[PDB]
Amino acid sequence: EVQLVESGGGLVQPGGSLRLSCAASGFSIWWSWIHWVRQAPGKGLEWVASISPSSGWTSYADSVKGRFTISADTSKNTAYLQMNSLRAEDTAVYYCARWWSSAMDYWGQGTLVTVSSASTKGPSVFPLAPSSGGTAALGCLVKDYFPEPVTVSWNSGALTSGVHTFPAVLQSSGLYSLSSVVTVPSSSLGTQTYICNVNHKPSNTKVDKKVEPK
Amino acid sequence: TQVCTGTDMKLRLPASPETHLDMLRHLYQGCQVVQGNLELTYLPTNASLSFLQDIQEVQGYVLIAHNQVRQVPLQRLRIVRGTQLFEDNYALAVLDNGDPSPGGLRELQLRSLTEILKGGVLIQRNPQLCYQDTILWKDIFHKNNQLALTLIDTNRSRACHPCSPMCKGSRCWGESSEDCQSLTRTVCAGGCARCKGPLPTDCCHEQCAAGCTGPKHSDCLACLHFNHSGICELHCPNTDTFESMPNPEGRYTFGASCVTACPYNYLSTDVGSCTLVCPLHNQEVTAEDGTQRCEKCSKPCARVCYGLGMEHLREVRAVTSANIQEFAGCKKIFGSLAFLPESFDGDPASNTAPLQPEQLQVFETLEEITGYLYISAWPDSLPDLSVFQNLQVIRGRILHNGAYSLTLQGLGISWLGLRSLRELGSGLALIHHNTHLCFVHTVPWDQLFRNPHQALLHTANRPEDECVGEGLACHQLCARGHCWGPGPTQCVNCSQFLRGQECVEECRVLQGLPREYVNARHCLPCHPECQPQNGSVTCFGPEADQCVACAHYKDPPFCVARCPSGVKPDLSYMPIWKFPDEEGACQPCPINCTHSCVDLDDKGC
Amino acid sequence: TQVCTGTDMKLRLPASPETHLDMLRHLYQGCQVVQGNLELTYLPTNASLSFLQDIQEVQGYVLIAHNQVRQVPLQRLRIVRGTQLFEDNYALAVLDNGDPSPGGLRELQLRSLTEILKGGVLIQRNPQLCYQDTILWKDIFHKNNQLALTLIDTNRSRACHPCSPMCKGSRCWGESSEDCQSLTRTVCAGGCARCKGPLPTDCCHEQCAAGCTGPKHSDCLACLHFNHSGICELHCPNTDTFESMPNPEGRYTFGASCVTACPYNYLSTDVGSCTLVCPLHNQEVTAEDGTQRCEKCSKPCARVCYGLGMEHLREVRAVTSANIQEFAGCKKIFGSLAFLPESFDGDPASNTAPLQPEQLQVFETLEEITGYLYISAWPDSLPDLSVFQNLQVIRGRILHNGAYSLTLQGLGISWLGLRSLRELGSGLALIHHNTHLCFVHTVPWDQLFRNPHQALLHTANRPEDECVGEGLACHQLCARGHCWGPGPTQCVNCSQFLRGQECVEECRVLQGLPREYVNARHCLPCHPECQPQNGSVTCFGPEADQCVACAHYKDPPFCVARCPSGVKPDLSYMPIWKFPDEEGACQPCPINCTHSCVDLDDKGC
Numbered sequence A: 001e002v003q004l005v006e007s008g009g010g011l012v013q014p015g016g017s018l019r020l021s022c023a024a025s026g027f028s029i030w031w032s033w034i035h036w037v038r039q040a041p042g043k044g045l046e047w048v049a050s051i052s053p054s055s056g057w058t059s060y061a062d063s064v065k066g067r068f069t070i071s072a073d074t075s076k077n078t079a080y081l082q083m084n085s086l087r088a089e090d091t092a093v094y095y096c097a098r099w100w101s102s103a104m105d106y107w108g109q110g111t112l113v114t115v116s117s118a119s120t121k122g123p124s125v126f127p128l129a130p131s132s133g134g135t136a137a138l139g140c141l142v143k144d145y146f147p148e149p150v151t152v153s154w155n156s157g158a159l160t161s162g163v164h165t166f167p168a169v170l171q172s173s174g175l176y177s178l179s180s181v182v183t184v185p186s187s188s189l190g191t192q193t194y195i196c197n198v199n200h201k202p203s204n205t206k207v208d209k210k211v212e213p214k
Numbered sequence B, C: 001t002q003v004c005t006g007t008d009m010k011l012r013l014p015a016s017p018e019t020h021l022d023m024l025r026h027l028y029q030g031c032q033v034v035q036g037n038l039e040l041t042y043l044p045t046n047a048s049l050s051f052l053q054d055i056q057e058v059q060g061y062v063l064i065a066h067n068q069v070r071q072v073p074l075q076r077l078r079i080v081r082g083t084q085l086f087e088d089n090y091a092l093a094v095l096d097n098g099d100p101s102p103g104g105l106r107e108l109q110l111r112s113l114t115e116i117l118k119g120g121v122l123i124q125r126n127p128q129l130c131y132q133d134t135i136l137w138k139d140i141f142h143k144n145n146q147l148a149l150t151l152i153d154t155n156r157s158r159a160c161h162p163c164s165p166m167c168k169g170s171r172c173w174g175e176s177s178e179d180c181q182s183l184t185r186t187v188c189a190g191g192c193a194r195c196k197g198p199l200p201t202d203c204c205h206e207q208c209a210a211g212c213t214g215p216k217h218s219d220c221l222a223c224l225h226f227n228h229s230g231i232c233e234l235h236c237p238n239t240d241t242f243e244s245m246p247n248p249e250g251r252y253t254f255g256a257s258c259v260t261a262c263p264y265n266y267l268s269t270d271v272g273s274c275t276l277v278c279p280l281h282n283q284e285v286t287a288e289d290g291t292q293r294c295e296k297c298s299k300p301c302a303r304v305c306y307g308l309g310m311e312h313l314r315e316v317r318a319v320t321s322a323n324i325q326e327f328a329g330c331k332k333i334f335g336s337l338a339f340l341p342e343s344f345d346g347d348p349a350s351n352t353a354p355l356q357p358e359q360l361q362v363f364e365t366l367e368e369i370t371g372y373l374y375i376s377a378w379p380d381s382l383p384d385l386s387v388f389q390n391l392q393v394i395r396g397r398i399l400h401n402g403a404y405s406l407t408l409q410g411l412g413i414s415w416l417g418l419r420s421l422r423e424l425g426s427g428l429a430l431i432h433h434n435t436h437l438c439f440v441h442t443v444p445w446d447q448l449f450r451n452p453h454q455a456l457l458h459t460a461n462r463p464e465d466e467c468v469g470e471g472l473a474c475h476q477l478c479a480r481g482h483c484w485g486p487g488p489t490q491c492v493n494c495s496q497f498l499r500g501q502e503c504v505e506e507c508r509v510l511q512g513l514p515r516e517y518v519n520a521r522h523c524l525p526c527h528p529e530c531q532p533q534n535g536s537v538t539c540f541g542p543e544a545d546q547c548v549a550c551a552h553y554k555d556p557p558f559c560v561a562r563c564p565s566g567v568k569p570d571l572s573y574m575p576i577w578k579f580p581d582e583e584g585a586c587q588p589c590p591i592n593c594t595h596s597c598v599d600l601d602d603k604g605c
């Protein structure tokens, strides 16, 4: 019931700024002790900043001091991270967490901040159809988008097992591309079709491409 | 000071045995009259107890129990009054001293005790104790029926030496020659409640207790009722006679003495007494001195927040989710606050949910507690006691365990954050076993206490030498190195200037975001219509008439955004129409209407 | 309930001997503590007195006089306090029992009586009484000088049997073995005011009376001063010590016990006591609960109507023509009202005219009597007590003869007519020897009384089975057959609807003279300008905006007689001129003046 739902990530140009929200339910942020933690792609966890809003104590890592402002609005029950003068090495997945005992018990889902000069590109989704077994595979191809991430689910989250969504690959063009497959009985083709739900938030694209045996 | 509080912990095992004796020591060092119960319990063998040596008089009961120490030096104790009794029957209770070279109380040595006014004596299970059976208790008692409430066990693990050869008739409090029992009642002439000898001329004044040195009411060893500056009297001072004599006016009855004015933390009554609690139909007004007084309500008495040990919560032992809402919006609680493990775990026997952390918000308005604050459990989410951010005084008129006005134990908060706390009226503070807690020794307790007989007792918190880095010691900008927690928002006193809650190096007087003036070490914003000045003062106050120069137009004497256009400063005043200069000063319009005027004039009036 | 009132009739011969014992019975049945004097007088030979068997304690005196009964079973009586004394000297008076098989008290049988706190004993003229000379009265007395106020006659018409062979030393209250005198004072050790035996360890607590079962102050057979929930204390509970213990807060002193809140009909004081009368400088405020409290007057105390037994009328025994005018316009009398033969006959010794019937008009406003109402004579002109038409409560804080709050005797009224009377706070009602009076048993007395220990005592009125016809029994329209007299204007509760004072079958809702709406079972008139409706509701309230249809013209939202013609609803409002439609709705006028307008317009403005 105690939850942290954070938002505000996405794409920013170098030198530009961005603000991250961390909305709480199940507890008061004001009396609590909120911490921000980042994780550059393929790296360890790194502490960034913290706030005890009631006491007024705000703390920052030498890495981000003077660029970042931590704050909290009590009425909204939300903690914020204002990030200014962003650079390449700020590109990471930022988490917010709640201090407890002497650890962080409740964490946010983590939002992705990507600092790049390239502009936002929407993905085009292409079907991967089975041919003429016992068990056969089908899926979608989410090609040419920027930046990360893309969310692929099947039949509005109703179909889960058999599903493999591959981690995206950086292409020569600088754009991303991934594939998402699923295996199903070879006697289900025709009278049972499946819909993949592609969602690229930065570009506002919600494609529902139904894959059919052809 | 000579008058001190007692304790009220009975046979309960000490909450921190490490600093239990230190409690006793601070409490009784120099004390002569114990306004309550003298409880000397759980004292280890080597225990240094010389701080008791001035106790002369006890109001409540004397309870000497569960000690391994061989003697308690209470030689100057003359009288126990028994205003309160142990187990509702006993004025002196000496219980379980020594296990069932060897430990245990050997002698009582109450060589001066000659009056127990109320209740009996209970002496039991003291394997090393000698001579208690020797004492003629009847003499010490005020009335004979007090004998009927006396039980004196003589089971013993050792042979006793005889009383000193110099002892009257084999009655003593110990092996010493000055340990003989002095009889002041059963040995008397004629009437006489107390005598200094067996002749009629050896009677003590009607108003003495314990005995005397002569016949006058100034020769008393103790006052039976009240001590009026060295004269024992039946009453504290409606005149019948046409004259005036010495001995100052009228007095307040405080304990068993008449005094000029009530002591520091007490309350004077219309009935002419000092108290720690007002009667019904009564408020509590603070004089310009800081003096408190109970007085009848002229209207019906207004709403009052009662804490624990008061009104409907007099039996309730802790703040739970059942009564947390009762403190909503309270600026001043009349009673105490206690947070126990059972507060946040929640008793599953009664349908009482565990109290949630954000429910402690109710206490955000709180400024004053008359009783005590006790915290033995706190939510693991909360790093500090910031919900008590605004608490200014804890009077301690009611003390937890009869001794402590502020107790913080077993918490695992990292800092305190009680940043408005300026006064602990009376009692000791105890902060122990908070393994994570720093900023305990960065607080100037010397300034929170009032009398110099109170102190902080601390043990098993985070080591002092381990509170050193950032987030662990006071901020640079805190004055005199005093703070309630980390950062420039936790200073006790501010080294330079305050911008709201924060300690800052400089106000934006000459340079900065929005310009500021200083007022009483406070950074405060200039009016938006002030024009920022190059390396010079921008404004002198918050009002738009206090700018050095205007950012836009000026409308004497104000710096304005635009010149008045048909505004009326109030009703019945005709509207004021103006236009700007080439310079920027707002100028009045000419002849009324047709050309209603503005810069180059407009119709429609 | 355990606490009951006494009587105060001394040696006076019973006002109705028929229902005298019933009075005693109701009064004492179940009673343990008599808050006053126990007067057992004029008891016939066969008299069943088992209702006395719970009396444990008497505050005033005990007067056993003029009885033919052979014994009064007062075996559980432990203590008489003597707060009031018989003949100003005696706490126990046993007088004239039996004439100067044969009648008269034979034994006293006060086998538990071990404390008379004040006053002496007077036992005289009891020709059948034995053993009174046997008792060692000294023991029972609290002080020895009470012996000097003792006279015990032993003139006797019969030989007495010896005390039971099982009797200590020939001292008993009767022939029985359990009738021996228990000595609790003269037989004691050392100090000790009361003991349970001759050893020092048998002393009762300083605070017991009568004796005890053990040495603790909870072992008392009676409290010397105050009973605090089973603990005897000197005082009813300004604090000196820094703590809180059990035993609830503070109490009110009521009789000789400390209680949480004052009993039903009493008054709490600022001084912390219960009372039936307030001091000077004091009013009497009713809380929203109905709770009463004495409190000081903030302004000078306002006018107050004092009845008999109060202020200037404290000696005056009846309402006469000399003081009748004092009650003019009184809504609430503080005291009692008594009307005696001497009221209407008029004492010819003093120049005091006989009071005339129409002078009783003064009481028409009267709603409350704190004392009692007593009527032993009434004018032969007046059929009822309708002058007390509006009397709602008789508190009975003062009871006539110490027992009755309402007495009606020897009157020859035909009905009561006390139609607003809803409460008799305390005491008994006595209505006897009114040979013409019906409607005595059509009154629900069960609802007028408060505690279930009070009752109506009635005898020799008009027989119940002879109050049957019209003008003799309740009206059909009276609910539950309850009424104060004849006709539909005397009902206690109204079966259907009320039109003013009268019980009616139907309101004129659908049909009738002037049409009506109903509001809380009350018929109330529609506005005259409402148009009566065929078999349908005519209006919804009294206001002219609440009609279904208008009788004349309508002026939104009102039904009016004529359309507004130059009326102004208030000053500074311009006058409103209107004219009717072909339908009847009032319509506003056009352009102001010249044609000032009305229907077809008029000049002169």
Ligand SMILES: *[C@@H]1O[C@H](CO[C@@H]2O[C@@H](C)[C@@H](O)[C@@H](O)[C@@H]2O)[C@@H](O[C@@H]2O[C@H](CO)[C@@H](O[C@@H]3O[C@H](CO)[C@@H](O)[C@H](O)[C@@H]3O)[C@H](O)[C@H]2NC(C)=O)[C@H](O)[C@H]1NC(C)=O
Binding pocket: B100, B124, B125, B152, B153, B154, B155
């Ligand atoms: C002197 O001490 C004796 C007991 O002797 C010893 O020292 C004590 C301090 C304890 O450590 C004892 O365990 C040890 O034996 C006391 O005698 C005891 O008195 C009680 C009543 O007060 C007797 O009652 C018994 O109670 C037990 C348990 O409830 C029952 O099983 C028995 O049936 C019986 O009723 C008990 O018999 C008695 N103990 C012995 C050894 O028989 C004594 O009270 C004490 N004297 C004084 C004045 O305090």
Ligand SMILES: *[C@@H]1O[C@H](CO[C@@H]2O[C@@H](C)[C@@H](O)[C@@H](O)[C@@H]2O)[C@@H](O[C@@H]2O[C@H](CO)[C@@H](O[C@@H]3O[C@H](CO)[C@@H](O)[C@H](O)[C@@H]3O)[C@H](O)[C@H]2NC(C)=O)[C@H](O)[C@H]1NC(C)=O
Binding pocket: C100, C124, C125, C152, C153, C154, C155
């Ligand atoms: C015991 O009783 C006797 C009287 O004996 C009889 O019983 C009584 C209860 C009455 O019914 C009596 O009528 C009857 O004879 C008491 O003796 C009397 O005492 C009084 C004083 O108290 C004596 O005084 C007399 O009073 C009369 C009238 O006022 C005068 O005329 C006399 O001159 C005289 O002063 C009286 O003499 C005496 N009666 C007799 C028979 O002579 C006695 O008081 C009583 N004992 C106690 C202890 O009460």
Ligand SMILES: *[C@@H]1O[C@H](CO)[C@@H](O[C@@H]2O[C@H](CO)[C@@H](O[C@@H]3O[C@H](CO)[C@@H](O)[C@H](O)[C@@H]3O)[C@H](O)[C@H]2NC(C)=O)[C@H](O)[C@H]1NC(C)=O
Binding pocket: B220, B221, B222, B223, B227, B228, B229, B230, B231, B232, B257
């Ligand atoms: C009743 O109470 C009065 C208080 O008014 C007591 O008088 C005080 O008692 C002290 C000690 O007995 C007296 O002597 C002085 O003591 C002080 C402190 O020890 C010392 O510094 C002085 O040199 C002096 O010797 C003194 O009369 C008085 N002190 C003061 C300051 O008021 C009295 O002791 C009490 N008596 C009874 C019957 O209990």
Ligand SMILES: *[C@@H]1O[C@H](CO)[C@@H](O[C@@H]2O[C@H](CO)[C@@H](O[C@@H]3O[C@H](CO)[C@@H](O)[C@H](O)[C@@H]3O)[C@H](O)[C@H]2NC(C)=O)[C@H](O)[C@H]1NC(C)=O
Binding pocket: C220, C221, C222, C223, C227, C228, C229, C230, C231, C232, C257
């Ligand atoms: C002093 O007053 C207190 C009142 O607080 C008395 O205590 C009461 O006394 C009764 C009877 O002695 C006690 O026993 C109970 O009696 C009731 C009624 O007879 C019975 O129903 C119960 O089963 C029980 O046995 C009880 O402790 C208490 N009663 C109540 C309701 O308060 C005490 O008797 C008085 N003592 C002296 C010294 O007079």
Ligand SMILES: [Cl-]
Binding pocket: B045, B046, B047, B068, B069, B070, B071
């Ligand atoms: Cl020792």
Ligand SMILES: [Cl-]
Binding pocket: C045, C046, C047, C068, C069, C070, C071
């Ligand atoms: Cl009989």
